[PDB]
Amino acid sequence: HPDISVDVLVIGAGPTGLGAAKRLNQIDGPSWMIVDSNETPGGLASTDVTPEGFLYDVGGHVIFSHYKYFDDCLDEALPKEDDWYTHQRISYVRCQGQWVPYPFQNNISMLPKEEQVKCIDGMIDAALEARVANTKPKTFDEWIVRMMGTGIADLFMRPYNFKVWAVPTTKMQCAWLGERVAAPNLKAVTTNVILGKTAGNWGPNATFRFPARGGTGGIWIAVANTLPKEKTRFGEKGKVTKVNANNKTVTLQDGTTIGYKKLVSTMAVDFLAEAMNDQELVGLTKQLFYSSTHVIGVGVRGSRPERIGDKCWLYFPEDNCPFYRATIFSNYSPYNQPEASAALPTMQLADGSRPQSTEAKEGPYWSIMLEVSESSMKPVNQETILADCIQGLVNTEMLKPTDEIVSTYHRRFDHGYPTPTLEREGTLTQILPKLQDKDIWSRGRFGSWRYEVGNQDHSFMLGVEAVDNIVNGAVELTLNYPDFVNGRQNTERRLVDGAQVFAKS
Amino acid sequence: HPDISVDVLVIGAGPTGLGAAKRLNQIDGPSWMIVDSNETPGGLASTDVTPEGFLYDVGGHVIFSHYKYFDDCLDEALPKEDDWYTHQRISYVRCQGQWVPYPFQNNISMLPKEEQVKCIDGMIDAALEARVANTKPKTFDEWIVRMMGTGIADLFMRPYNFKVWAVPTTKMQCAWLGERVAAPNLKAVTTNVILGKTAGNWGPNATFRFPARGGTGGIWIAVANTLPKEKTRFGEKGKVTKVNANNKTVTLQDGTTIGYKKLVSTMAVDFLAEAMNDQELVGLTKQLFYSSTHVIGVGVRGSRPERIGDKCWLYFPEDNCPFYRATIFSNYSPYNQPEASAALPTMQLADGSRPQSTEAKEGPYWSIMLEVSESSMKPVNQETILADCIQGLVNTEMLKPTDEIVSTYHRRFDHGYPTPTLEREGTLTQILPKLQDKDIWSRGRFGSWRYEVGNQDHSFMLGVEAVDNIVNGAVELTLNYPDFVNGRQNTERRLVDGAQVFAK
Amino acid sequence: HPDISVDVLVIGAGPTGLGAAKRLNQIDGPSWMIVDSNETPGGLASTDVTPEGFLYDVGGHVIFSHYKYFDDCLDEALPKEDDWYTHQRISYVRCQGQWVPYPFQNNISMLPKEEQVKCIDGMIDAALEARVANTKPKTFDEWIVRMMGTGIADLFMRPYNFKVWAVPTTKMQCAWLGERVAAPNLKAVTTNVILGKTAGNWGPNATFRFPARGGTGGIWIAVANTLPKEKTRFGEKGKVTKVNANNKTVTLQDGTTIGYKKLVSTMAVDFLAEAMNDQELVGLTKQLFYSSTHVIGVGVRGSRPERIGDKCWLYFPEDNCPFYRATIFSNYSPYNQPEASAALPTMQLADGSRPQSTEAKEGPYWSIMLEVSESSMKPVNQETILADCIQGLVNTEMLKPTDEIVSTYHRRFDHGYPTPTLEREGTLTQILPKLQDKDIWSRGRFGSWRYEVGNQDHSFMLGVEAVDNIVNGAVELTLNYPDFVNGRQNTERRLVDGAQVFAK
Amino acid sequence: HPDISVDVLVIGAGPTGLGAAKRLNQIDGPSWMIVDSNETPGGLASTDVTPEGFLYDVGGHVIFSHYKYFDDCLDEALPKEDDWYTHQRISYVRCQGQWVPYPFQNNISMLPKEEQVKCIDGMIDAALEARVANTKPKTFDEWIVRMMGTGIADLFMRPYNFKVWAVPTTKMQCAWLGERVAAPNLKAVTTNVILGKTAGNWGPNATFRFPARGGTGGIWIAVANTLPKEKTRFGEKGKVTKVNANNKTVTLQDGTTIGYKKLVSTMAVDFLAEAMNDQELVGLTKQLFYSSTHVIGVGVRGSRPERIGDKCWLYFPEDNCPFYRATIFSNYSPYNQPEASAALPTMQLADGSRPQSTEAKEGPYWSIMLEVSESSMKPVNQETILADCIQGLVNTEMLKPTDEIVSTYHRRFDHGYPTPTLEREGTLTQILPKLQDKDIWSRGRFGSWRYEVGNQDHSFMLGVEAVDNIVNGAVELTLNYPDFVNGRQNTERRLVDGAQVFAK
């Protein structure tokens, strides 16, 4: 008999595990327990802070919720109106010395005329081909070129996606992008070129909310806090080392054994296979491809520069900088960096030179967060990446050579992005049924390895739906039908359902 | 304070209400109650019997299940292997003196060659057009011509569908038919013509199961039997006469009042509106269109004729008979008609004449079930419809003039088919949400009026999913995404879920 | 026995008839003569002069030669270098206050950005439709929209062409436009829009040459001058009044009879039918359609305005003026109007006011030539059309209100354009072969009624090829295959062929 | 000064040179002479005879005339109705043991069903592709697959054309096939399949006429006989050995020199270049591809076998025989072989064995004429080809092993077909204008090297038109616009034109 026994054991307390736990706790039927090897819940949705007081998420983290249930839990966790800040979804593509409003194709009036001609000519070819198309695109690359035409694809989506995924667009699938037909909106694009007009895809109703304090990681701490503490086990005490799927027993690092009837595993599925000592699953899961993420944070002295303005996130297809995306994290919340009266010495100037004075001075401060990808196809020199990113900041005109840097941050995350390669589904449809046959619901960004349902809200719901499948026979819609859950507002499932209402009387 | 109070009240004990009841009874959380004006549950999935012992369902009833939950409840209700008979899904189209295996277009090799030419030419036009199509069809008719071409459409789907829906194909939407692109499989059609082959869409894996006894109605009586009797109110005592949506109170015919928190109503939504005395809802529901169904049953003396054989259901596009579909109901089960030893006099010959003898004679017996549609666009002479059907049976060579008829059945069901008119959705998206905001889940063949999810399994699951939405925040998938539930095996929800397992 | 007998009689001495005559004269085999009711040859390619000394062609006449034969004869007729002026083919469309270089679609960068959007959107639609099109356009209108899209069609080709043809574009065929597929060059149009480029279809190698003196009429007088006079009969003496096709006899105004073996008739075919007293043919020819042309000329005091510059011809789609086309005729030759030292009083200002001073002042002078169409579907008030045109010149900013007009000209030509109606070919198929069988070669702008081969060179060659068919069994290529002759440099036939070289 | 001088010198008295001569003789203007290395006029349109009396053309020669002028000259040459025989254009494709009527695709009902399925499926692919095609095919091969689809292309046109051209279909252009859009008539093909119908493209309307005597060679002998003898120089005396283009002098075998103003050369343009000793042209003409033709004749004892019947010519795509085409030459005229009473010994049986008796026996007789192509890409063993052809006849069931062969004929023609390779035009547009600059009209099957205008009627007209260009400035339409001349009835040019009528 094992040290402790529950009906449903949840491994991991990132958004996915927390979702499983939130639904288990709501149902309050079967006994359950959630473990995590980290004392702080949140997983990849956590937040670090430098010794100098600059918070950084694990790269740009921006919530768009497809589910009311997710909204219910965020609201419960952070209920005050000043627990959040609201911003418009402002993004740009850095291209040939310009900040081009997203979406790129609707804004190429900013490029030289000769290049506009090439772009439009390419999209004309794409529109004429789309008119007689009778096949679906088979690769990400085909999808890109059919949507954009060659000239536009070459400027942004092709080089950008390589810098993101660290694999060529020709080696990726495109089903994950959804069911929308790959075809240009030629009229929209030429209309903006003719009018000499720019237009981003944001406005008063295209907004997101960011937590006032603690960064994204604050959300999950708050959510976790709403669970019964005695049913949680976070820290070294909660680190799983072995899973005997046959005995439905899990062994933690401190030797504790847990018996379960159903397992919800949100750890990376390749780590699960190793922990199960299953050679067959180990074999299969090493067929899955992923990239690592280097997050670099740069704290800068001064009020926010006019040139940065209200920008939120930014895309970098060009090769004059190593990052694919930058986030003006200081725009998300004034509490993401020290207040103006806090004193910090300048560490270096943006151009790498030493400051004239070593003395500590006041702010105000602003803050840039950058992401660099790494794969077996795209190596990252960890000893020079910070300095190279900072050089990239000068090259892209985000910093002047003279800008004062008061804080740096660099961290490498081994499992960053699960790759939508051509082979992914072929591999997943062998792995998941084998785990399912053992009453193991492997779910999450790396639990189920599906980027298209790999955001915070998706992950959370993957955990919720896993519990709902386990207990109520619910369809696991997010897991199996990304296009379905993404094409609708999911209003039916709520933090308070009829069940708990009727029970309370 | 009303006479009774329950958390969830279910109106109607046809397949839909029974689904609601079964899910409620499984969850066993909220209190609930199910009422019906009929002593026998089943609704349009019931079975009648003539005084001579011939059973008849409400027209051809053949189950194809999309849901394990449904199978679970059917197995629970009728657990024995001898409770069921298995049959292949054998259907034909009567056309120009021949029985053409379904699907029609794959079997036009049976028609005269000149006609095959016309058919193939039309489908060639449809293929070339589909090659450059970039719009979806907007009407049932357009959908048909794009799938089949003009020649084929005119031979079967066009005239047949008018006989079924009792409204022209140009007046119906086509979304209900699924997301599949409207375009011909030219190669499969020409291949069969070239090889001179016929081929039905059945075989050892395209089967269905039919209850050994009591006809389709027997399923629902047995499913109803698994419910706690004290939670059911069936008969005149359970006939709903008034619904007060404001006070969440229902009043039965015998004056009984029932308070509810949530209402699952499976009666026809136009009847519900009337019971609510809600004049706005009455106006909206009057915008919906439906056809009535005449079910005609004919019991015949003799061993099953070889010309009939293993046929199960049959389609009739042509003018020489008023029915759109016939079912050889005696093939579905030997208990659908009297044993051979049963003595019965001949009532008439199939040509309409009086029999030579009035003496009761033995069988064996076989049995034909026919359906005729009626609507405001397609009236039917009620007084002659039986005799017209019988003459139709002679015209199509299903009966010989000399065949001996020993039993007849005819019943008109006012609400037969909810019609997928062009207008249906615009009207429903006004009705269903308005009812929803009053905490009324109106669901089922006429409860929510969507034929594409209007079979027994769909109906049953509409009831299940309505309860599951009310209690467990489930998505009402069947109701809102026909294409979704119909395109997969719905395996997740079972009669015993983790919930009930952990409970013990 | 008739007064005169020749092998080949040529009726009419405009370009077509003179073509016939030049070929007959070069071959110098069969006997022949040529008649015309006018003393001065040239037909609709003649030139008038006002009492004030301003020349006017019969509307805008610009030669583009598709044939070396035609060149040879023009060079023979006018061999001196200073017999000609050369100009670039500079044309513009007047639109929304702007002179838009031709071709219009390549120059819409001159219009407001909002107009450009509408034009490009329209042309995108046409490009996507052209990608799947598998029929040819049936009407001029279809052809226009397929080529240009709606937005561009509506700004220029549609309204302009109604103003020209005096019938709606929907009533005309489109084969006469040639064999090019009706489809937009979307890339070329969008590229010029993107670059903000304008670009005319002219330059150092897109030129025309114009006669130094006598206007276009000078060419035909001089070509006619190369024929032997005794084979000509021009004036009242040569007016044909009767054609007896069966007796191969023609009667002149003065009673002279001329017998012929072959007849080349270049007068309007409807006139020919009347002269033939052939009611079958009168009936048929009356089915053809044509428009009348009002040629208005305006002589203006002053040096050529900068706003006018080197413009040659100009198109006017808009309804702020009655003319469809203006020509800056004073740009074609300095001898189209008086010398600067010539004194002329001002007849009126462009604003319509007439000054009290009759003082004759000197020049220099410039000149505008205008055309207004008339037909049964578009009447023209002959009494006001001059003043309306002049006000149109003010509306389009060709003239200032204060400009001083020193000469006016207005003449109506009954047969102006032979219209390419939908019915034209059907009707000509009944007419031309009927005449052919009577040994009558009816040819020319109204002789054979085909506008696409109705220019001076085409006409000339229709006459040449008629003779060549009569004498040498040549194919009448220009008559039957406009697309053929228009798509190549016709170099083979020359004023001096091998036959004449060897004969020496 | 040269031994003899003329305005126009014609080299070669095949159809092309004879066409030039006929027109010169008719015009009777410039002086002229025609020479040939062969005492008998006709070139590749001549006829041989075996010692046993069996006539053979240079392969199957069947006249389809596109020109009235050609008809005129043939009718002049052989004016009696009994100078000609008329036959329907009857042809078949030998495929998988069947004689499939031409055109092949309309008759695939004769093939096994599973193969019909493959053919139709391929043509369906081609039809759907043609529906969205926006390019012209670039190779003969692409043109074939677009017309026929893969399956049909593979059975006939692909393998057959390799056997004809002795180069792959992928190495040939396709413009020579005309302007017709490359697309299948899918309905025509499916219809005959569905109906199980076969039908050739012949009937009482589709006929040809063949000379009663002397084979095709007899036409040209008779036409040449209409020329003034004194203006012809045929035989060893007429063999051109040198051409001095600069001096405009030709040198014959016997040393005679002829001066000309204009040269119409109908010899192979590669031999012309050699005779001109022009190294630039010799290099260019060596870039032209051509195949050699082997003609095999087989005379057989017996009345015409039923299996052969009224067949005229036959196509052989398959590898079980070396010939690409066979002609039942004995069907063209009873005078193409000895009369029945003529006695001839049997030379061998079809299976190659000796006859039982070596004595002469009577007919009747019939006759097969066969064509085998040869090129650098496809060698022919000259020593075994006769035997291989005869075996092919047995393999194709044209001869029984027992049939008695009474005559054999074999002859190799080095210049057989001028090949429409991808490069042909690039080369010819360099060669022809250079010759044209030296007043040399190089014209004919190998004179101008264009197969699509390489028949007897085209060749004749190439010469006629060459003269007409030289003397009358006519356009050379046949030479430059094959599609134009082949798409019309050319009725204008006659053996007696107006010119000759007016002269008398």
GROMACS .gro file of C-alpha atoms in nm, chain A residues 149 167 218 258 298 391 435 437 470 475:
model
   10
  149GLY     CA    1   0.227   3.579  -5.239
  167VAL     CA    2   1.302   2.507  -3.838
  218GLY     CA    3   0.091   3.672  -1.019
  258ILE     CA    4   0.112   0.812  -0.440
  298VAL     CA    5   1.695   4.482  -2.041
  391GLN     CA    6   2.348   4.509  -3.010
  435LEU     CA    7  -0.102   0.681  -2.236
  437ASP     CA    8  -0.501   0.315  -2.230
  470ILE     CA    9  -1.255   1.184  -1.628
  475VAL     CA   10  -1.564   1.571  -2.480
   0.00000   0.00000   0.00000
